[PDB]
Write a protein that binds this ligand. Structure first.
Ligand SMILES: N[C@@H](CCC(=O)N[C@@H](CSSC[C@H](NC(=O)CC[C@H](N)C(=O)O)C(=O)NCC(=O)O)C(=O)NCC(=O)O)C(=O)O
Length: 1336
């Protein structure tokens, strides 16, 4: 090895000894170090054995022949040089290891191999080098090498093909070749499929076998139970032993990528030397630029497996954490669950498990970032002098800044959240009582409150804009900041230190590399600290006490046996059932009897192993069907609620439904039994749910029934019918053991056994007649009583943000990326000045200009981040104002036609992506667009010839960008829609834990939850593979431009001054990272800009008549006497109201009677103009209603609706939201409403904080509060809508409102009889018009 023939000549030939030693030791050596390690994977991972195919044999036979040929050399050598013995034998032995390896790989089922491909590639390259040398030298030993090379080439070609393999849509990962598994080509079929036709959930491939929940949840369960047995228990230790072997391969892929990333600056330093050093062989530059393409492209292929491993491991964590929490939630004791809120347990997957997946992306960087920093600091310390310390200074000041900034954000980040949270419940209230809200004209009153809370959160967002501005400045200007400090302290520390390209552009490339680790380490630290509390919560939940599975003896088919059993609701709390004993025989009806808080429901809970048994013996025999007091309704259809995951039997189902008297309920419900009952679907009355729960229990066909007050909410006739056909000895369950908790005597004599208790103690149980004869405790008890988003949407967002702010940001950021190219061009000029006297003559002026330009870069980066977030706040406030005004200035018809969920989602999620997502995405997309365009301008300007690569790369970028957008706009949309159902189902199962554990349907629910999370993963996994595909394809576009920006800089080195080449290559090096973010953010932006369109949709719908006309406004005393006249009124809805010509005189009490389907209520809607008059001229006194603005009439007429809607806040804000009426008037009205005694009782006086809908207040109180509102209004026209306190409200409406004209729509004739001039509506027509005396 000497430089004359290898380096310094025009024919770069390797020496003969080098050829025969190192070029042969490289490949053989590769297989020898990998072979042992490869058994680990081959053994731990197995997939069967591949059959005998021609390909596998072809490879094995060539491996045999190759070994022979290599040993044939040893034979000829045996037939002087020491290398002519060891090298052929070593090659033969490693070849024998190669053929054995394909053999064992066949045995272990590996269709495509990575080691058996890279090894042949390395051998091929080594053979190619020797081949070229041997063909340039020119029989004896050469022909053996030609045979070796041809066989190696054919072996390499064979190794590319994938062997035969050992539901449809199987994940192509299982059937993909290794060469296509690094380029992620197996998803390309989806990509094109994403552009031609939209993707549904039916086309996503089935989750691969390992990631499925049944494979990753049981392993975590086993590892956690093992740790608990070890007993103190830590989840981090269990998470390690579970997800550590897979995450361990991330270290190898990360470490190689880190080392290969810093090869860029080193090869750049060599290339700057080659350009600067003349008379050097040309081929040297071609070799140097070839190493810039192989190293930075292999870096892409090795980095986009670290990311894949980290993402797959995080997704596995999210799948296993969700399943483990779900499986633990079904065995947790009640006392333990009291310590955790229901919604907080759902947070264990909604945010807690998501935090682990988010962490897993960058968790492996807490060591890579310090390693990148240390290695870079070592490299640049050699590049320049000890000035690194100065740059280190800028680094040791920048990192703490980020740190505190991150912390600060987090705190008020949470603040923002809670503010939004508050608003959202308020928003719900407006969507709840919208009808009563528009009846009294409270729209303006509540719009002000929503605007106030909006301003409250907008101040926090405004501050966080400042914190994001410094975060972006530290992301962009930190590499420059370090560069400026280092260059300044280097060039001015003395006079013998100069700045040439090899000392400037290499350091610049290192600083560009160093930017990411410094600016992402604080985020990683914040994420780890945030996950430190998520881990604590997860461990706390998973370490709760488990339910005793043997406490109740569940013997399969004296039916229920309890002796000396005392139960508790908690370990330390006193017993609730003391010393209970009773024996319920098979097929007997037993009624639990007691007062409130006696311990009746506790008995049924204890028979289900819900109570904590401190002592005793319980031997419930056979299956148990539980009808809980609080009915648990699944959001599935009513049919599946009754079925409860059981085979449908038409005769049995149709015998159960009417026996519960569910036929009228089926009739009223829209779809019948297929209607979607539950909280999300149609709401059901308490009695209806009681029947449904009972119907489900009856269908379940258990032998033991525990009916914890099934007839509480059903009426007396319905209850008696139910008992007759279901629980009665002559019902459907004649031969079923029934144990019922009741407080109604009506069915007691029919009960076989009555268990009467007092204070959780058995008290003289027995049969009804015997207990009555005994005259004891029972006698006492009885005596007790889709396409591409339009640019018009972008223009709409620009109009909302403001043209001034929109154009100022673009101009000021173009200024940022113009002062950046010129500053780097100033460095190009600086590194090309004469070096006369060993001192840069113009060091002062050039350093000052560079620093001033960079400071100009420090005012424009902070200027475009302060003009995109401020604009974001300004646009969000305008969008919220417009949406609120549109919604509040619209009639009630679309409120029925448009579901409330849509509007609440628009007010919740849509406003979140406009203020907290769009400003960040637009700062990065626009930040990366000119980063690319500006980088391509320097490359093109330095070497014009680099323009014929622009056409071929433009097509690749266009076709990759279009496919990725068209396919990933839908995949994360399919993932978002499938994420909420998992949390919803977990909430549902948490609500009904006791029912699930009683019916013993735990396995079905556990499998449903894992199927739903599997459906979520089915959309999440293609989403993370799409990013890898996009990056890999566009990295090699930014990688081949590195080759071409340096190739044209090598062929034209003569017409270059070693001042542009380093600049061009340095800028091309950062093209790769900024190009995959231009496209990722071009896809997020499209799915984020659709929020503006969905937030502006209601700006184009029919609105109500103007609230204030102000041209034909009525006088202050508009209802002078209150003379109402319906002149040929007709209300469209075909006409519910028709031919209505009636006259209600001023101060004359008038009521409206009619059956269901008449226009009684619709008549009130006529008075308040809720629905526009199809044909009618209602006039109050001498003024037409249709001409008057809505608010005016709605203020001058009052209504007391069916169910009074009390809004959250104080009672005074309920009575007078505008606070227009004085405190004395409020007090007088409240006293006149029979409420003075109660309203004076609250500690908060008039400021009593009533919850959503006035849950704390009683129904009677809420009704009297609505009456107080009407009384405080002091208007001459009042309408009443009648459905205990009836005597009070009727007397109050008859007390002082005799002066005012009162219309009354009552479903009860008793009250209407008092009112004169009763109007009767048959089908909208006036059937009778006269006083009740003329009625009879
Ligand atoms: N040197 C790194 C290179 C990392 C790399 O090349 N890939 C980056 C791309 S820049 S990822 C960096 C990015 N930061 C920003 O771009 C924000 C900058 C500033 N806040 C502003 O507003 O301007 C960020 O926060 N990202 C987090 C996210 O994805 O949400 C990555 O993390 N890829 C993630 C992926 O592909 O999924 C390494 O060691 O590998």
């Amino acid at each position: 090895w000497e430089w004359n023939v290898t380096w310094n000549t025009s024919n770069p030939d390797f020496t003969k000894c080098f050829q025969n030693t190192v070029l042969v030791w490289v490949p053989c050596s590769y297989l020898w170090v990998c072979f042992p390690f490869y058994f680990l994977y081959l053994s731990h991972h197995d997939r069967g054995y591949i059959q005998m195919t021609h390909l596998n044999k072809a490879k094995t036979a060539l491996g045999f022949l190759l070994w022979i040929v290599c040993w044939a050399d040893l034979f000829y050598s045996f037939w002087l040089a020491p290398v002519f013995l060891v090298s052929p034998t070593l090659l033969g032995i490693t070849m024998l290891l190669a053929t054995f390896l394909i053999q064992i790989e066949r045995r272990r089922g590996v269709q495509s191999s990575g080691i058996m491909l890279t090894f042949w590639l390395i051998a091929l390259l080594c053979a190619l080098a020797i081949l070229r040398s041997k063909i340039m030298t020119a029989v004896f030993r050469d022909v053996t090498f030609y045979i070796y090379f041809s066989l190696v080439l054919i072996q390499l070609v064979l190794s590319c093909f994938s062997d035969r393999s050992p539901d449809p849509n199987p994940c192509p990962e299982s059937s993909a070749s290794f060469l296509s598994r690094i380029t992620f080509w197996w998803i390309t079929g989806m990509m094109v499929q994403g552009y031609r036709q939209p993707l549904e959930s039916t086309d996503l491939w089935s989750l691969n076998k390992e990631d499925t929940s049944e494979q990753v949840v049981p392993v975590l369960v086993k590892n956690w139970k093992k740790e608990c047995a070890k007993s103190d228990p830590s989840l981090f230790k269990v998470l390690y032993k579970t997800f550590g072997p897979y995450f361990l391969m991330s270290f190898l892929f990360k470490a190689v990528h880190d080392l290969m990333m810093f090869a860029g600056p080193e090869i750049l330093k060599l290339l700057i030397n080659f350009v600067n050093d003349k008379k050097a062989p040309e081929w040297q530059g071609y070799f140097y630029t070839a190493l810039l393409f192989i190293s930075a492209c292999l870096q892409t292929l090795v980095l986009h497996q670290y990311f894949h491993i980290c993402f797959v491991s995080g997704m596995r964590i999210k799948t296993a954490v969700i399943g483990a929490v779900y499986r633990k939630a079904l065995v947790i004791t009640n006392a333990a669950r009291k310590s955790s809120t229901v919604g907080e347990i759902v947070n264990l997957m909604s945010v807690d498990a998501q935090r682990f997946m988010d962490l897993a992306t960058y968790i492996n960087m807490i060591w890579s970032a310090p390693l990148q920093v240390i290695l870079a600091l070592y490299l640049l310390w050699l590049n320049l002098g000890p000035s690194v310390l100065a740059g280190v200074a800028v680094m040791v000041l920048m990192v703490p800044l980020n740190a505190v900034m991150a912390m600060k954000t987090k705190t008020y980040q949470v603040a923002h959240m809670k503010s939004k949270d508050n608003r959202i419940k308020l928003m719900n209230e407006i969507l709840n009582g919208i009808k009563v809200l528009k009846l009294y004209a409270w729209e303006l009153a509540f719009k002000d409150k929503v605007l106030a809370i909006r301003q409250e959160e907008l101040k926090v967002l405004k501050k966080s804009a400042y914190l994001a501005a410094v975060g972006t400045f530290t992301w962009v200007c930190t590499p420059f900041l370090v560069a400026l400090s280092t260059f300044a302290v280097y060039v001015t520390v003395d006079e013998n230190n100069i700045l040439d390209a090899q000392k400037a552009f290499v350091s610049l490339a290192l600083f560009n590399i160093l930017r990411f680790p410094l600016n992402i380490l604080p985020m990683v630290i914040s994420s780890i600290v945030q996950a430190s509390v998520s881990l604590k919560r997860l461990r706390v939940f998973l370490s709760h006490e488990d339910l005793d599975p043997d406490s109740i003896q569940r013997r399969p088919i004296n039916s229920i046996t309890v002796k000396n059993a005392t139960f508790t609701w908690a370990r330390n709390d006193p017993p609730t059932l003391h010393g209970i004993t009773f024996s319920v025989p098979e097929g007997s009806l037993v009624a639990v009897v007691g007062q409130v808080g006696c311990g009746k429901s506790s008995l049924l809970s204890a028979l289900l192993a819900e109570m904590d048994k401190v002592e005793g013996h319980v031997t419930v025999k056979g299956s148990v069907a539980y009808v809980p007091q609080q009915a648990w309704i699944q959001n599935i259809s009513l049919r599946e609620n009754i079925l409860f995951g059981r085979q449908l039997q038409e005769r049995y189902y149709k015998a159960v439904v009417e026996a519960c008297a569910l036929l009228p309920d089926l009739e009223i419900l829209p779809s019948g039994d297929r209607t979607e009952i539950g909280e999300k679907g149609v709401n059901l009355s308490g009695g209806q749910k009681q029947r449904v729960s009972l119907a489900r229990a009856v269908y379940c066909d258990s032998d033991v029934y525990l009916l914890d007050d099934p007839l509480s909410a059903v009426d007396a006739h319905v209850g008696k019918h139910i008992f007759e056909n279901v629980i009665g000895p002559k019902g459907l369950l004649k031969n079923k053991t029934r144990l019922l908790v009741t407080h109604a005597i009506s069915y007691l004599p029919q009960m076989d056994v009555i268990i009467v208790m007092s204070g959780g103690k058995i008290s003289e149980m027995g049969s009804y007649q015997e207990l009555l004869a005994r005259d004891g405790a029972f006698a006492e008890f009885l005596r007790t009583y889709t396409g591409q988003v339009k640019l018009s949407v972008y223009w709409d967002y620009m109009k909302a943000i403001g043209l001034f702010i929109s154009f100022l940001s673009i101009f000021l950021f173009l200024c940022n990326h113009v002062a950046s190219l010129v500053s780097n061009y100033w460095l190009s000029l600086w590194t090309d000045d004469p070096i006369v006297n060993g001192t840069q003559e113009h060091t002062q002026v050039r350093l000052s200009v560079y620093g001033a330009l960079g400071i100009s870069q420090g005012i424009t980066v902070f200027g475009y981040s302060m003009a995109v977030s401020i604009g974001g706040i300004f646009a969000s406030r305008r969008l919220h104002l417009d949406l609120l005004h549109n919604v509040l200035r619209s009639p009630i018809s679309f409120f029925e036609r448009t579901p409330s969920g849509n509007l609440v989602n628009r007010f919740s999620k849509e406003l979140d992506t406009v203020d907290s997502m769009i400003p960040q995405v637009i700062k990065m997309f626009m930040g990366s667009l000119f980063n690319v365009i500006g980088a391509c301008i320097i490359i093109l300007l330095a070497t014009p010839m680099a323009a014929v690569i622009i056409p071929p790369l433009g097509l690749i970028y266009f076709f990759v960008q279009r496919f990725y957008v068209a396919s990933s706009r839908q995949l994360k949309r399919l993932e978002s829609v499938s994420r909420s159902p998992v949390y919803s189902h977990f909430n549902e199962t948490l609500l009904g834990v006791s029912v699930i554990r009683a019916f013993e349907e735990q396995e079905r629910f556990i499998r449903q939850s894992d199927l739903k999370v599997d459906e979520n993963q089915k959309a999440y996994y293609p989403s993370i593979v799409a990013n890898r595909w996009l990056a890999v394809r566009l990295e090699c576009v930014g990688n081949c431009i590195v080759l071409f920006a340096s190739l044209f800089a090598v062929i034209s080195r003569h017409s270059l001054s070693a001042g542009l080449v380093g600049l061009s290559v340095s800028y091309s090096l950062q093209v790769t990272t900024y190009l995959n973010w231009l496209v990722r953010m071009s896809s997020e932006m499209e799915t984020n800009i659709v929020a503006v369109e969905r937030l502006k949709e209601y700006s184009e719908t029919e609105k109500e008549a103007p609230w204030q006309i102000q041209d034909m406004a009525p006088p202050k005393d508009w209802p002078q006497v209150g003379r109402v006249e319906f002149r040929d009124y007709g209300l469209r809805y075909d006409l519910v109201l028709k031919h209505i010509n009636v006259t209600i005189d001023g101060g004359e009490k008038v009521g409206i009677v009619g059956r269901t389907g008449a226009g009684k209520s619709s008549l009130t809607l006529g008075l308040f103009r809720i629905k526009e008059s199809a044909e009618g001229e209602i006039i109050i006194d001498d003024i037409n209603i249709a001409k008057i603005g809505l608010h005016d009439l709605r203020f001058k007429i009052t209504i007391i609706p069916q169910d009074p809607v009390l809004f959250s806040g104080s009672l005074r804000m309920n009575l007078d939201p505008f606070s227009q009426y004085s405190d004395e008037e409020v007090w007088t009205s409240l006293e006149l409403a029979h409420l003075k005694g109660f309203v004076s009782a609250l500690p908060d006086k008039l400021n009593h904080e009533c919850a959503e809908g006035g849950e704390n207040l009683s129904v009677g109180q809420r009704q009297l509060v609505c009456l107080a509102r009407a009384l405080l209004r002091k208007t001459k026209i009042l309408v009443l809508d009648e459905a205990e306190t009836d005597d009070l409200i009727q007397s109050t409406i008859r007390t002082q409102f005799d002066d005012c004209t009162v219309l009354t729509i009552a479903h009860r004739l008793n009250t209407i009889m008092d009112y004169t001039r009763v109007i009767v509506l048959d089908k909208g027509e006036i059937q009778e018009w006269g006083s009740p005396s003329d009625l009879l």
